[PDB]
């Protein structure tokens, strides 16, 4: 009876997205920027749309290693670009320092970094469904949900030969949900819009007749 609570139901930490720097091979750029998308996986998306308005603090962790699952010591800079501030142009761009961009310097050898993001939205809660136009690409888009981009880079000075994979985990604390919504039957087409395929799929799997059971 305590596992039906909305607080426990959203509890556990999960994989929000996998990003890669890849500075070694044909792509030498040497950093990456990962806009925070909680909807990333269609499984995590279908449990969120259950509720229309929800207010929660997030907590992150970055599990990193090379392509060998081998983790030698080499330094990484995890920066958090808050919503409304400019993004880094290139691996040396002066945005990588500033002041106001909170950063985390962690070697690979260390156990994974961890950090806690507060509630960033202007409105008193997030909205997963916003009717009406922000001011037809525009229809139903919340401008106020952006949580920031978590730009990453490897401090070591020039062109290491090592592509560094990294995984990003999220978990939701202190969650509070408002008016409920029925779960989605139809498959998803694209990320930001509900649009569903022409051909409809039934909700229940058919049987022989209105009568026969099993």
């Amino acid at each position, epitope marked *: 009876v305590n596992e039906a609570s909305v607080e426990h139901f959203y509890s556990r930490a999960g994989l929000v997205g996998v990003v890669e720097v890849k500075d070694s091979g044909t792509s*030498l750029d*040497g950093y990456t920027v990962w806009p925070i998308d909680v909807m990333g996986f269609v499984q995590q998306r279908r449990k969120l749309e259950l509720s229309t308005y929800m207010r929660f603090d997030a907590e992150f962790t970055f599990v990193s290693n090379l392509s060998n699952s081998t983790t030698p010591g080499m330094l990484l800079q995890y920066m958090y670009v808050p919503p409304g501030a400019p993004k880094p*142009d*290139g*691996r040396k*761009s*002066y945005q990588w320092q500033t002041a106001t961009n909170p950063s985390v310097f962690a070697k690979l050898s260390d156990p994974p970094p961890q950090v806690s993001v507060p509630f960033m939205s202007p409105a008193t809660a997030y909205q997963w469904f916003y009717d009406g136009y922000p001011t037809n690409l525009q229809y139903g888009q919340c401008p106020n949900n952006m949580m920031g981009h978590f730009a990453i880079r490897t401090v070591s000075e*020039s*062109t*290491t030969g090592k592509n560094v994979h990294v995984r990003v985990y999220m978990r939701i604390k202190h969650v509070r949900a408002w008016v409920p919504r029925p779960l989605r039957s139809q498959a998803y087409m694209v990320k930001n819009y509900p649009t569903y395929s022409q051909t409809i799929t039934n909700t229940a799997t058919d049987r022989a007749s209105i009568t026969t059971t099993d």
Partner: antibody, heavy 119, light 108 residues
Framework: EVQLVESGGGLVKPGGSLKLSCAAS????????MSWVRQTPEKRLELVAH????????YYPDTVKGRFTISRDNAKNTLYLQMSSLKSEDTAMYYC????????????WGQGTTLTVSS | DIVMTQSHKFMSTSVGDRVSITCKAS??????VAWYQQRPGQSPKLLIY???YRYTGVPDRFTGSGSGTDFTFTISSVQAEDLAVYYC?????????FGGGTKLEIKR
């Protein structure tokens, strides 16, 4: 397809200053780093200056450091090079190139313009 | 800085032949290197960058290989259009640096 043109190059006397301006068309011009490269009469090539795509980072070699200045305008699709106090060795032809980052190779090269420092 | 020196200021060959040029690094550059094609009176084109990989559109007869401080740029089959000066680059660190140049010779 793509066009990199330059201007301003020409004979000049020592000490003077001259603005080489590069103009581009056929691609999105704010998404690419840019650079200048000069080719000595011996055809020895060397770097001149570098700027990031959005103006974040600007790099100068030790020789031209403080003597030149580079800037770009994403609205005009131009790349400007302000260069002063020209010595003897500053004569060579200057190419206007394009990159996708710091360490990528230079894919395009302007037709190049000469520069000459003499009495 | 870090100097990239090329062994031969000139090399000779003929059409259909096979020629391969080296490049030598002042210190360890890892795999970062690039090879350029400068035809007479023309803006030097990009061919092969970062050891083996070659830029989009470069014909397949152009190959390269190496690692560390010792590099090689291999032409499977020489043609007429292949006459020009070649250069090797170091993009491993700033500032970038170019080799002294190498000029082919087709002797008929």
């Amino acid at each position: 397809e793509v066009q990199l043109v330059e201007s301003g190059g020409g004979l000049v006397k020592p000490g003077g200053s001259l603005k080489l301006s590069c103009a581009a068309s056929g691609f999105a011009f704010s998404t690419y780093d840019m650079s200048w490269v000069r080719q000595t009469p011996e055809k020895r090539l060397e770097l001149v200056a570098h700027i990031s795509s959005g103006g974040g980072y600007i790099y100068y070699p030790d020789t031209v450091k403080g003597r030149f200045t580079i800037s770009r305008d994403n609205a005009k699709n131009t790349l400007y090079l302000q260069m002063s106090s020209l010595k003897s060795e500053d004569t060579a032809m200057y190419y206007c190139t394009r990159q996708k980052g710091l360490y990528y190779g230079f894919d395009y090269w302007g037709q190049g313009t000469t520069l000459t420092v003499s009495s | 800085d870090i100097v990239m020196t090329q062994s031969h200021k000139f090399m000779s060959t003929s059409v259909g032949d096979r020629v391969s040029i080296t490049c030598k690094a002042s210190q360890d550059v890892n795999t970062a290197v690039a090879w350029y094609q400068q035809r007479p009176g023309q803006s030097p084109k990009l061919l092969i960058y970062s050891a083996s990989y070659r830029y989009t559109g470069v014909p397949d007869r152009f190959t390269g290989s190496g690692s560390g401080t010792d590099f090689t740029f291999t032409i499977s089959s020489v043609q007429a259009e292949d006459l020009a000066v070649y250069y090797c680059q170091q993009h491993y660190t700033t500032p970038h640096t170019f080799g002294g140049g190498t000029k082919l010779e087709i002797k008929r």
